[PDB]
Amino acid sequence: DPNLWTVKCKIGEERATAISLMRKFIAYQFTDTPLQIKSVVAPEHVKGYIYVEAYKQTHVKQAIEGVGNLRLGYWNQQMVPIKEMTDVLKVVKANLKPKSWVRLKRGIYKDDIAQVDYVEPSQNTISLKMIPRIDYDRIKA
Amino acid sequence: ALETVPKDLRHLRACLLCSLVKTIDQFEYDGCDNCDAYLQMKGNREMVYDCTSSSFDGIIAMMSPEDSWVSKWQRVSNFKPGVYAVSVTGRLPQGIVRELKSRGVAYKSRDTAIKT
Ligand SMILES: [Zn+2]
DSSP states (O other): OOOEEEEETTTTTHHHHHHHHHHHTTTTTTSSSOOOOOEEEOOSSSOSEEEEEOOOHHHHHHTTTTTTSSSGGGGEEOOOOGGGGTTTSSOOOOOOSSSOOOOOSSSSSTBBBBBEEOOOTSSSEEEOOOOOOSSSSSOOO | OSSSSOSSSSEEEOOOOSSSSEHHHHHHHHHTTTTTSSSSOOSHHHHHHSSBBSEEEEEEOOOOTTTTTTHHTTTTTTTTEEEEEEEEEOOOTTSSSSSHHTTTOOOOOOOOOOOO
């Protein structure tokens, strides 16, 4: 059973980190310097450090050498105990389902609980059900 | 290979059979690399938007499914190494699951995420 290591990354650059290391692996699997990594875990609920799969601590050091996104947490590679290989894959309740209850972030109905009606397949806009709280143009000028 | 890596981070989805995480251009030009004779999602956009959805989370760089602890837990060890997901929510309609049982493909719920 392979071990899991924790490396430090830039905040905001998790998916770019994963999509860059995957292309390094594919860019070096056929040379004289391959990569000894199995996978790299990047949860969407975290922000700041990622997870990597390797048997020994020298493999992560000889695999992440040369990347500028992982140059900060390069001098230290923490190790998790074996019971933490499972809590990493757990996701608590994507988040796109009709007839559900979402809230707003910007606009006038901030932090107001609404409902979803229809979803646009273009992934551009979404239908919402809220209640207007305007004055019907009586108080404002 | 170079085809299973999504080129752009915008408009990417994940399937409900092998949790294949790619961009919307590769599911239409090439499709599901882990199932092409049972799904046939290359050559159109209705079948790509029908089975494969965007409601998914969690990203893993599967490289050696024959030797890794995560690949056996997600039952993705008999698949091609590449971009996969760990919780792909949703369910197939009662229009493509009936043909999968008669052909010998047991459609499993890949959603390992807990509900409340
Ligand atoms: Zn699939």
